[PDB]
Design an enzyme around this catalytic site. Structure first.
Site, PDB file in Angstrom:
ATOM      1  N   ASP A  36      80.982 -48.381  15.777  1.00 11.75           N
ATOM      2  CA  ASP A  36      81.542 -47.183  15.141  1.00 11.75           C
ATOM      3  C   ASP A  36      82.700 -47.731  13.805  1.00 11.75           C
ATOM      4  O   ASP A  36      83.612 -48.193  14.083  1.00 11.75           O
ATOM      5  CB  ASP A  36      82.110 -46.286  15.853  1.00 11.75           C
ATOM      6  CG  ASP A  36      82.601 -44.819  15.566  1.00 11.75           C
ATOM      7  OD1 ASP A  36      83.045 -44.446  16.437  1.00 11.75           O
ATOM      8  OD2 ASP A  36      82.183 -44.520  14.588  1.00 11.75           O
ATOM      9  N   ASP A 221      81.111 -44.733   7.316  1.00 12.21           N
ATOM     10  CA  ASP A 221      81.256 -45.021   9.214  1.00 12.21           C
ATOM     11  C   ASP A 221      80.403 -44.621   9.491  1.00 12.21           C
ATOM     12  O   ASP A 221      78.569 -43.116   9.707  1.00 12.21           O
ATOM     13  CB  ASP A 221      81.896 -42.942   9.389  1.00 12.21           C
ATOM     14  CG  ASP A 221      81.864 -42.916  10.680  1.00 12.21           C
ATOM     15  OD1 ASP A 221      81.826 -43.433  11.327  1.00 12.21           O
ATOM     16  OD2 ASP A 221      81.810 -41.668  10.905  1.00 12.21           O
TER      17      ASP A 221
HETATM   18  O1  LIG Z   1      85.160 -39.195  14.187  1.00 11.61           O
HETATM   19  C1  LIG Z   1      85.186 -40.317  15.940  1.00 11.61           C
HETATM   20  C2  LIG Z   1      83.061 -40.680  15.658  1.00 11.61           C
HETATM   21  C3  LIG Z   1      84.313 -41.678  14.001  1.00 11.61           C
HETATM   22  N1  LIG Z   1      82.071 -42.145  13.871  1.00 11.61           N
HETATM   23  C4  LIG Z   1      81.498 -41.348  14.569  1.00 11.61           C
HETATM   24  C5  LIG Z   1      82.154 -40.667  15.819  1.00 11.61           C
HETATM   25  C6  LIG Z   1      82.496 -39.383  14.932  1.00 11.61           C
HETATM   26  C7  LIG Z   1      80.923 -38.347  15.288  1.00 11.61           C
HETATM   27  C8  LIG Z   1      81.324 -37.687  16.664  1.00 11.61           C
HETATM   28  C9  LIG Z   1      81.708 -38.931  17.448  1.00 11.61           C
HETATM   29  C10 LIG Z   1      80.747 -38.429  19.116  1.00 11.61           C
HETATM   30  C11 LIG Z   1      80.931 -40.278  19.414  1.00 11.61           C
HETATM   31  C12 LIG Z   1      80.914 -41.405  18.456  1.00 11.61           C
HETATM   32  C13 LIG Z   1      81.673 -41.223  17.998  1.00 11.61           C
HETATM   33  C14 LIG Z   1      82.059 -40.491  16.894  1.00 11.61           C
HETATM   34  N2  LIG Z   1      85.732 -40.382  16.931  1.00 11.61           N
HETATM   35  C15 LIG Z   1      85.132 -41.473  18.055  1.00 11.61           C
HETATM   36  C16 LIG Z   1      84.674 -40.572  19.125  1.00 11.61           C
HETATM   37  C17 LIG Z   1      84.948 -39.127  18.605  1.00 11.61           C
HETATM   38  C18 LIG Z   1      84.732 -38.102  19.601  1.00 11.61           C
HETATM   39  C19 LIG Z   1      83.985 -37.237  19.669  1.00 11.61           C
HETATM   40  C20 LIG Z   1      83.028 -36.857  21.318  1.00 11.61           C
HETATM   41  C21 LIG Z   1      84.004 -36.337  22.308  1.00 11.61           C
HETATM   42  C22 LIG Z   1      85.132 -37.322  22.285  1.00 11.61           C
HETATM   43  C23 LIG Z   1      85.756 -38.163  21.304  1.00 11.61           C
HETATM   44  C24 LIG Z   1      87.083 -38.778  18.817  1.00 11.61           C
HETATM   45  C25 LIG Z   1      87.101 -39.708  17.430  1.00 11.61           C
HETATM   46  C26 LIG Z   1      88.443 -40.170  16.889  1.00 11.61           C
HETATM   47  C27 LIG Z   1      88.087 -41.126  16.003  1.00 11.61           C
HETATM   48  C28 LIG Z   1      89.472 -41.647  15.225  1.00 11.61           C
HETATM   49  C29 LIG Z   1      90.723 -40.990  15.779  1.00 11.61           C
HETATM   50  C30 LIG Z   1      90.428 -40.538  16.626  1.00 11.61           C
HETATM   51  C31 LIG Z   1      89.444 -39.473  16.984  1.00 11.61           C
END
Ligand SMILES: O=C([C@@H]1CNC[C@]12CCCc1ccccc12)N1CC[C@@H](c2ccccc2)C[C@H]1c1ccccc1
Length: 373
Positions: A36, A221
């Site tokens: 990621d 991303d």
């Molecule tokens: O936006 C993201 C990532 C970035 N690329 C994919 C992302 C974006 C699309 C959604 C997702 C889902 C799973 C894995 C990655 C990603 N985050 C990491 C995980 C995310 C999260 C999602 C669901 C539940 C808990 C946490 C919080 C966030 C974040 C990023 C930066 C700083 C704070 C929070």
């Protein structure tokens, strides 16, 4: 090539993320870890969860050190909570090194883990500025560069459709791309922030003020599936894509991701859909280049029917160049020189009439006016 053992070290399921094997602790515990570039924490499932086949067991690791502080990562749309610590971490099909890295042991989560994704954790490859709880928590890659002689660069070849790909750590594998690599500056080291200067649909300029393309940022991303666009840009892009693909008619909800359309096996009329060109700021004054993506990229496969989701979507936190964009290309995260390179992928999924492209140079004036402040 010398980076051969890192080739094809990524696996995944379509729309569910690309992951790499990482080995944590002593004795070894190997997990599948989401790659990621849009986040900055290394975090692993560390307690049983319905969607997890395996998880990290800190009590079994003699080298695990508890940092005695909790960590929480919020989202739209779910969250995860855990405990901070450090442990020994290697990537069996990545660099030949072992580092002591920060690791977040995930104990509870909401809508984080994806049923059937096969990944059990996340590798945040972006910068410390966006790390939780704050920027004092050194991201994995920062630890890697500080503790070893691995060069401050990684590159990603994401091969779309059950998916595969390569994360080359410490260098560039020339077998993974064709033609030239074109570089756009990393505007700021938090997300991998870039500047988009022009958008075309079938060679036709969208003719928006370029500030709108980058409001309030544009990022690269690997962990986001879609090309996400700010509302105003999304609307204009959809209007243009519709007009360009008018030899067939689609329900309004298709363009909104609320409806899918399916075609009989191997009859998807790719030719009726336009190519999309994103122009990125180059490395020289008034110079840009463009990356061009095919419908094969922005129409994602979800019987004898092939179902597709429109994988361009609306964002209120800027442009997100996700896997839809990255899958056409070999993408170089040249951290050492604060720049991101794009080249035509050796695993580029195309037809016999059109191909994904990286082309330049172009003359684009006032490109500095395009960035958000
Ligand atoms: O936006 C993201 C990532 C970035 N690329 C994919 C992302 C974006 C699309 C959604 C997702 C889902 C799973 C894995 C990655 C990603 N985050 C990491 C995980 C995310 C999260 C999602 C669901 C539940 C808990 C946490 C919080 C966030 C974040 C990023 C930066 C700083 C704070 C929070």
């Amino acid at each position: 090539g010398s980076f051969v053992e890192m080739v094809d070290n990524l696996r995944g399921k379509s729309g569910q993320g690309y992951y790499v094997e990482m080995t944590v602790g002593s004795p070894p515990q190997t997990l599948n870890i989401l790659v990621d570039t849009g986040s900055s924490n290394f975090a692993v499932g560390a307690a049983p969860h319905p969607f997890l086949h395996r998880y990290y067991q800190r009590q079994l690791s003699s080298t695990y050190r508890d940092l005695r502080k909790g960590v929480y990562v919020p989202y739209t749309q779910g969250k995860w909570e855990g405990e901070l610590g450090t442990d020994l971490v290697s990537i069996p099909h990545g660099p030949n090194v072992t580092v002591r890295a920060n690791i977040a042991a995930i104990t509870e989560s909401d809508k984080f883990f994806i049923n059937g994704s096969n990944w059990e954790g996340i590798l945040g490859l972006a910068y410390a500025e966006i790390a939780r709880p704050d920027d004092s928590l050194e991201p994995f890659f920062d630890s890697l560069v500080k503790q070893t002689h691995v060069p401050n660069l990684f590159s990603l070849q994401l091969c779309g459709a059950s998916v595969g790909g390569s994360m080359i750590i410490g260098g560039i594998d020339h077998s993974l791309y064709t033609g030239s690599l074109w570089y756009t500056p990393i505007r700021r080291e938090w997300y991998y922030e870039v500047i988009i200067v022009r958008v075309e649909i079938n060679g036709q300029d969208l003719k928006m003020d370029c500030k709108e393309y980058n409001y309030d940022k544009s990022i690269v991303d690997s962990g986001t599936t879609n090309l996400r666009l700010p509302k105003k840009v999304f609307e204009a892009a959809v209007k243009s894509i519709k007009a360009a693909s008018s030899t067939e008619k689609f329900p309004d909800g298709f363009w909104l991701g609320e409806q899918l359309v399916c075609w009989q096996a191997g009859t998807t009329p790719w030719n009726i859909f336009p190519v999309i060109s994103l122009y990125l700021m180059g490395e020289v004054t008034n110079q840009s280049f463009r990356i061009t993506i095919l419908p094969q990229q922005y129409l994602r496969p979800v019987s004898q029917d092939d179902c597709y989701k429109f994988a361009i979507s609306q964002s209120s936190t800027g442009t997100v160049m996700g896997a839809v964009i990255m899958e056409g290309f070999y993408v170089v995260f040249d951290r050492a020189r604060k720049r991101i390179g794009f080249a035509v992928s050796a695993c580029h999924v195309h037809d016999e009439f059109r191909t994904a492209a990286v082309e330049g140079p172009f003359v684009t004036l006032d490109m500095e006016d395009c960035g958000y402040n």
